Amino acid sequence: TTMIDGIRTALRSIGEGEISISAYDTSLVALLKRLDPQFPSTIDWIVQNQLPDGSWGDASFFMMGDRIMSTLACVVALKSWNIHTDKCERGLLFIQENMWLVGFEIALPSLLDMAKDLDLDIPYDEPALKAIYAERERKLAKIPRDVLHSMPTTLLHSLEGMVDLDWEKLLKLRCLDGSFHCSPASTATAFQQTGDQKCFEYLDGIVKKFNGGVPCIYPLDVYERLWAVDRLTRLGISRHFTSEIEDCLDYIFRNWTPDGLAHTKNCPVKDIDDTAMGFRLLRLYGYQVDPCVLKKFEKDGKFFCLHGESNPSSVTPMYNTYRASQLKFPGDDGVLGRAEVFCRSFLQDRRGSNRMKDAKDIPGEVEYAMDYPWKASLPRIETRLYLDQYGGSGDVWIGKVLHRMTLFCNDLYLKAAKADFSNFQKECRVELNGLRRWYLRSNLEKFGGTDPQTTLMTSYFLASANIFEANRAAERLGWARVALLADAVSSHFRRIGGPKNSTSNLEELISLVPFDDAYSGSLREAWKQWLMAWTAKESSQESIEGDTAILLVRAIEIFGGRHVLTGQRPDLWEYSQLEQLTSSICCKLSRRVLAQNGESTEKVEEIDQQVDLEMQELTRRVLQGCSAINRLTRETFLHVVKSFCYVAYCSPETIDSHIDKVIFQDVI
Amino acid sequence: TTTMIDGIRTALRSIGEGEISISAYDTSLVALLKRLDGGDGPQFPSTIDWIVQNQLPDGSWGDASFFMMGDRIMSTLACVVALKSWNIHTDKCERGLLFIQENMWRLAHEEEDWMLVGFEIALPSLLDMAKDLDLDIPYDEPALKAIYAERERKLAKIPRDVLHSMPTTLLHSLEGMVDLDWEKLLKLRCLDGSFHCSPASTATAFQQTGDQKCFEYLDGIVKKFNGGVPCIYPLDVYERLWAVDRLTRLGISRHFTSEIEDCLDYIFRNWTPDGLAHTKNCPVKDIDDTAMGFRLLRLYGYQVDPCVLKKFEKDGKFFCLHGESNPSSVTPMYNTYRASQLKFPGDDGVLGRAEVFCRSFLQDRRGSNRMKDKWAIAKDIPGEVEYAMDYPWKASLPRIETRLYLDQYGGSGDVWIGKVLHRMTLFCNDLYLKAAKADFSNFQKECRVELNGLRRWYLRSNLEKFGGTDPQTTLMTSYFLASANIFEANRAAERLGWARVALLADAVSSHFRRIGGPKNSTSNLEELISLVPFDDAYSGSLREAWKQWLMAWTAKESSQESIEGDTAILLVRAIEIFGGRHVLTGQRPDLWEYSQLEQLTSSICCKLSRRVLAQENGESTEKVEEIDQQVDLEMQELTRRVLQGCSAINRLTRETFLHVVKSFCYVAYCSPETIDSHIDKVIFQDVI
Incomplete structure (x- = not known):
């Protein structure tokens, strides 16, 4: 409990960004x-952050580009001001012997040229040096200087190595805070060349805000929020911070631009990584967002990361787009349709290769996203896996220096999540152990699977994988219980021929569910209807799975005790229409699992193609947080259907390997 | 002390196919x-590996600690005709071949009921192997002429076409049978493939059919015992049911609640509409297992339907098997009678018929020393029945039965009669007795301790001033009733509280006789309750319960109605105040089920207070028998509600009702002479 409050105070105090100081x-x-x-505190910061091998940069992750480039850039300060020559050469040793990333081949050449303006015995005569000094010119040539001065670009982040540029038409390109694409280096060199006080102002604040020392990118108010939300969300503890999350998710909505999202509010150049993350979470949390903001990154069928700079796209952004395409609504611009196909192909061509590099487990994160599309993504399944994928302090970010994200790439994040998940597994085992009794003492295993522990286990597991909350135990057990009765009854009819020859008064049977004073009567009525559905859908071809699901949401809505006001007309329609979709979607599923007869990949791929279709309009009506149905009622529909899909799209082998990994393979 | 319990728990946790002794035969x-x-060696070399080992020093085979002719003869000779037919260890072969010769004359002294199964069917068939191989043995015995002719008498009684039509108990010992029609017989075996769960019957069946599902049973039987094989397997139902029955009556059931419930579950899953067998996979079912299963399951709060018994009713009699009208034994009729004690008013009539029938069968068998059993043999078989016969459910107080049962549990003493003598390691245990006699002694020790505190409390409270004109036995009995029922270690809170409050009521009642009623109540008998010790949570609601009891006095006073009803309600209200259980009255049927429990106890106890008045007034035996049935009926409805695990009120709240009432029943149906012989046998008659 103390930890939740820990993460809460960290999130409530959200701001410009929790970033590690960059040595360069x-x-x-x-x-x-x-x-x-001018900032003696930059230097006061420098003297202390020297690593024992006499080097600089990130301590916890040793990277060649990072330790060298960060180390010497500190040296060019200490010697060019002729102070602390003791550490100055002590680290000059590090550079000499280990002489064998972003903007590396642009900021390093101007840093050696700057090393020449001082004296400093460093192997300039490196064979590795010529290869990246050649790329200096291999890039400063493909950049059109007259275009670098017309629209803000990703280059403005590396102006320390840029020579002889028109500042009259360049100051027109900065970010809203005055920075040059949010690099304090590019603004320092831009200030050495022009005294613009709004371009100084960005710099002094950054040192004031950190009492000396300054990162390699700032601010990042959007990126940080978006990613902190996705991280807490995947870790399953999002429910604890609902006001705080919806607090800053609002901030993302406020700063939505028709050109997309940047990593910060005040950067006019947008990128697909932040836009896709923003689009997914905004739509996921029920905001009105239009995916057409993506076609700014489509150029002739291909999907880049920036609007114009058609660079080679990396792996992480395509993952985040692929996920955003999974919340596809039917009314959406086709760009999201095209995006799904492209990003799936990008990540599939790469799946069978270790070319998944960009963080701890990035291939596992991706396998999931591809093997379990939205219709079959049960939150506890994803969350159990994510505990074994979240890097914590292990995740590192590739900027101008190696830097880390204090706020959302945290170790407290894991200790909190693995706690809340262990208590879920503990509450789950006691839950079913109580269920097992209930199943047996009901002469109820005589009906059902030929291994009723398996038909119980999956039936409880589905309900708990979806309605997993602390207190919602009332609903979860209700779901599991009613599910079991329905399975049991369907089994009885299947090997007897139908209610035609129902010798028994099997209506009753709900009295196996314990009496609650508010629950029992209405649950009787719903169960009565499921039976009445059998005798009518009986001598026909329509399946019953549609009605089995519809009954379920009906019970889950009786537990948890919310009713749908029925005087209001649109309240009635939105409910009645949700049931149609669930009845329709689960009936189509039960037709796919019959064609798996088992032939015609062409026919099965047709059914899948149209279930995905109907699922979209359901997913729309469930998430559309303005709709006139209670968010919890909407979730109840999504829960049941997703579980139905999950089952219909999964081998029994895969299904309980999950059961073992989520309920029984204890975390912590 | 606790260490012994953990052994039993570990035995129960690993319950399974059965822990049984090997049969030499x-x-x-x-x-x-x-x-x-075709290899010229026996198919099972470890069956022999056992034989050479377990030859007893007396030169025989079979059960060692229990000498029986049937067991020594068949076990030895079957080992010998094995040794010679494989021509090995012929030195030992005669070291017991001699035993047959010397003790052969003890077969004419067999007991009228103690006789092996298939004795006259597999043994004459065992002599025939003692003549295909030449064997030096005394065939001419005066005991043989009567049993060898009993072979044709019984193989003229078997209907050949019915032995092949429906599985039967004859299928258990078919090794000495001719007329082999396996085409129509293998369809009759068990789910194991075994013939009525006998490995002997399966050996004959495999030479005569290369059935690999019938071998599989045999291969397994020797793997699981790594050589050697018993005379019946498996016993997954019998063992559990009986392991339960034993631990229950020994009063130590309380410790293994999780273990019992696990294997009692094994019975509920494997219940059939045709009854229970000794195993999961035997299609011919028996009343001995069925009555034990119904009784234990119903006792432990399971939904069981007694109409499963009518499958054993053939024209007013009950036998043991379906259709097959056989010499009924005593223990199976005992065990049915016990199950009949738990009849609910809604039950199928068979429980009515079962009780009355077995009542006669066990009465007509009680006097004559025909109390010997044909199936089982054990320390005290008539004592078990004497109790069950003298003390019906309504007066069978758990510490009374358990104390008495301690001196009648056989330990290793019990031996079971199959084709050979066998014993049940897990459930016919000596540690069971070692543990129970300990746990009971720790109970009586704590009972004596509480008594001194009650004695002090009674004396010092000036509470003997009025009341029963011999204080010391009013206290002693009144404490006994509470402790016989609510006996647990930790529940001392309730036990003493029950006994204490009871004394107040009896005291207040007597004072009311001497003054003529609350009309002439000069006193403030209300605040008499603060004579109970003051816990902050117990009293004051306790005061309110007491206040209500007095209110019963003044309101029922201008009438004839008894107050024993309200005094019984007052106790259960009090016991419930101790132990601190409340009734969540938000939920309606909890309120109803409670409110009706109060009615039934108040109602049952008033009838008791009217019956014991017609026994003072010496009124027509038939008039008292009218009241006894009218009480017994309500008792069933209460016993239903107390044991039905459906309607939701804490089981302890329901049991508190049964406890108060069972104590009232015991008192009204028991002589004061009999009553404290019980007090002494349970509290003062030190075990160990």
Whole structure:
């Protein structure tokens, strides 16, 4: 409990960003001379963050580009100000011996050229040096200088290595805070070249905000929120921070642009990674968002990361787009349709290859996203897996320096999640152990599977994988119980021929569900209808699965005790229409599992193609958080259907390997 | 002390197919089976590996600690005709071949009921092997002429076409049978493939059919015992049911609640509409297992239908099997009678018929020393029945039965009569007695301790001033009733509280006789309740319960009606105040079920207070028998509601009702002479 409050106070205090200080950008800001050093606290930061091998940068992850480039950039500060020559050469040793990332081949050449303007014994004569110094010109050539001055671009992030540019038409391109694409390095060098006080103002605040020392990117108010939400959400503890999450999710909605989302509010250049993350979470949490904001990253069928700079697209952004395409609504622009296909192909061509590199388990995160589309993504399934995939402090981010995200790439995030999940597994085992008794002492295993522990186990598991909450135990057990009766009864009819020869008064049977003073009567009425559905759908070809599901949501709605006001006309329609979809969607599923007869891949792929279709209009009506039906009622429909889909799209082998991994393979 | 319990728990946790002793007869008769591939060695070399080992020093085979002719003869000779037919260890072969010669004359002294199964069917068939191989043995015995002719008498009684039409008990011992029609017979065996769960009967069946599903039973029987084989297997139902019955009556059922419930579940799953067998996979069912299963299941709060018994009714009599009208034994009729005690008013009539019939069968059998059993043999078989016969459910107080049962449990003493003598390791245990006699002694020790506290409390409270004109026995009995029922270690809170409050009521009642009623109540008998110790949670609601009891006095006073009803309600109200259980009255049927329990106890106890007045007034035996049935009926409806695990009120709340009432019943149906012989046998008659 203390931990939840820990994450809460961290989220309530959300802001510009929790980022690690970058050694390179801090010393490059140290290089700015008094307006009459200008930030002696940049230097005061520098002296202390020296690693024992005499080097700099990220300590916990050793990277060549990072330890070298961060180390020397601190050196070019200490010696060019002729102070602390003790550590200055002590780290000059590190550079010499280990001489054998973003903007690396642009900021490093201007940093050696800057190393020449001082004296510093460093192997410039490196065979590795010529290969990346050649790419200096291999890129400064494909960049059109007259285009770098016309529209804000990703290049403006590396102006320390840029030579002889028109600042008259460049200051027109900065971010809203005055920064040059949010690099303090690019703004320091832009200030050495022009004294724009709004371009200074970005810099001083960044050092004031950190009491010395400055990161490699700022601010990142959007990226951080979006990703902190997705992370808490996947970890299953999102329910604890509902006001805080909906607090900053609002912020993302406020700053939605028709051109997409950037990593910060005040960056005019947008990227697909942030837009897809934003689009998914905004739609997932019930906001009105239009996916057409994506066609800004489509150029002739292909999907890049920036609007124009057709760079090679990385792996993580395509994952995040693929996920956003999974919340496809039928009324949406086709761009989301095209996006799904492209991103699936991108990640499939790469799945069978270790070319999944960009974080702890990025292939596992991706296998899931591809093997379990939305219709079959049960939140506890994803969450159990995600505990074994979330990197914690292990995740590192590739910027100008190696940097880390304090707020959402946290170790407290895991300790909290694995706690809340263990208590779920504990509450789950006691839950079913109580269920097993209930099943047996009812002469109820005589009906059902030829191994009723298996028909019980999956029937309880589905309900708990979806309605997993602490207190919602009333509903969960109700779902499991009613499910078992329905399975039992369907089994009895299947090997007897129908209610035609129902010798018994099997209406009763609900009295196997314990009497609640508010629950029992209405549950009798719903169960009566499921029976009445059998005798009518009996001597025909329509399946009953549609009505089995419809009964379920009816009970789950009786437990948990919310009713649908029926005087209001649109309240009636939205409910009555949700039932139609669930009745229709589960009936089509039961037709696919019959064609798996077992022949015609062409025919099965037709049924799948249209179930996905009807699922979209359901997913729309369930998430559309303005609809006149209670969000919990809407979730109840989504829960039942997803579980039905889950079952219909999964081998019994895969299904209980999940059961073992979520309920029994204890975390912590 | 607690250490012994943990052994029993570990035995129960690993319950399974059965812990039974090996039969010498069945073991060698399986050695006689030749390889499936023709190898000139026996198919089961470990069946022999056992034989050489377990030859007893007296030169015989069979049960060692219990000497029986039938067992020594068949077990030895079957081992010998094995040893010679494989021509090995012929040195030991005679070291017991001698035993047959010397003790052969003890067969004319067999007991009228103690006789092996298939004795006259598998043994004459065992002599025939003692003549295909030459065997030096005394065929001419005066005991043989009567039993050898009993072979044709019984193989003239069997209907050949019916032995092949429906599975029967004859299928158990068919090794000495001719007329082999397996085409129509193999369709009659068990789900195991075994013939009525006998490995002997399956050895004969395999030479005569290469049935690999019939071998599979035999291969398994020797794997699971790594050599050697009993005379009946498996016993998954019998063992559980009986393992339960034993631990229950020994009063230590309380510790193994999870273990019992697990294997009692095994019965509920494997219940059939045709009854219970000794195993899951035997199609011919028996009343002994069926009555035990119904009784234990109903006792433990399961939904069971007694009409499963009418499958054993043939024209007013009950036998043991379906249709097959046989010499009924005593223990199966005992066990049915016990099950008949739990009749609910809604039950099928068979429980009515079962009780009355077995009542006669066990009465007509009680005097004559025909109390010997034809199936079982055990320390005290008539004592078990004497109790069950003298003390019906309404007066069978758990510590009374358990104390008495301690001196009648056989331990290792029990032996069971199959084709050979066998014993049940798990359930016919000596540790069972070792543990129970301990747990009971710790109970009486704690009972004596509480008594001194009650004695002090009674004396010092000036409460003897009025009341029963011999204080010391009013306390002693009144505490006994509470402790006989609510006896647990930790429930001392309730037990003492029950006994204490009871004393107040009796005291207040007597004062009311001496003044003529609350009309002449000069006193403030209300605040008499603060004589109970003051816990902050117990009293004051306790005061309110007491206040209501007095209110019963003044309101029923201008009438004739008894108050024993309201005094019984007052106790259960009190016992419930102790132990601190409340009735969530938000839920309606809980309120109803409680409110009706109060009615039934108040009602049953008033009738008791009217019957004991017609026994003072010496009124027509038939008039008292009118009241006894009218009480017994309500008792069933209460016993239904107390044991039905459906309607939701804490089981302890329901049991508290049964406890108060059962104590009232015991008192009204028991002589004061008999009553404290019980007090002494349970509290003061030290065990160990």
